[PDB]
């Protein structure tokens, strides 16, 4: 990985780029014929929002997702990981990948509400004052439809709307 640093001495600014130790993919993949890191390790349809060890390898130090041309993912799995990272931040599973706070900012104390499987952003969601009749009920989304083909070990399929 590359890093950039700025050192100011004598009212003169100098900018340099220095390489750093870079992690290497583990050897002997199970499926060398796979196209992206997911099928090469037989992980397709086998991860969820809570599998942070898998999700951390595809995000930046501040919680942002990495490009697809870098990771090598397929558009189908890059969208899944991009959505599972959104729900991991919201559930409090990535406390070391927080946004960068500019100098002179102290986040205010806000109601701590525990949550998981949060599809939508809290602030952009309005309350359901009218549930509606039984045949036209306004459901509450739970999870993500992108994870609907995931491996289910039960007879009841993933319910995405409560």
């Amino acid at each position: 990985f590359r890093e950039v640093v700025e050192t100011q001495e004598g009212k003169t600014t100098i900018i340099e780029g220095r390489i750093t130790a870079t992690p290497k993919e583990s050897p002997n993949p199970p499926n060398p014929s796979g196209q992206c890191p997911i099928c090469r390790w037989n992980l397709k349809h086998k991860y969820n929002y809570d599998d942070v060890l898998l999700l951390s390898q595809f995000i930046r130090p501040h919680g942002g997702m990495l490009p697809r041309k870098i990771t090598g993912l397929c558009q189908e799995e890059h969208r899944k990981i991009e959505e599972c990272v959104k729900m991991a931040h919201r559930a409090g599973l990535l406390p070391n990948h927080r946004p960068r706070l500019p100098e002179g900012v102290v986040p205010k104390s806000k109601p701590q509400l525990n949550r998981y499987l949060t599809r939508w952003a809290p602030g952009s969601v309005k309350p359901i004052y009218k549930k509606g009749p039984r045949w036209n009920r306004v459901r509450m989304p739970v999870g993500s439809p992108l994870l609907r083909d995931n491996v289910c070990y039960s007879r009841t399929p993933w319910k995405l709307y409560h």
């Binding site: 002997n28 993949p29 199970p30 499926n31 390790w41 037989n42 992980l43 086998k46 898998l54």
Partner: peptide, 8 residues
């Protein structure tokens, strides 16, 4: 040390 059907 990984078989063809190994899943992390």
């Amino acid at each position: 040390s990984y078989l063809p059907g190994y899943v992390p």
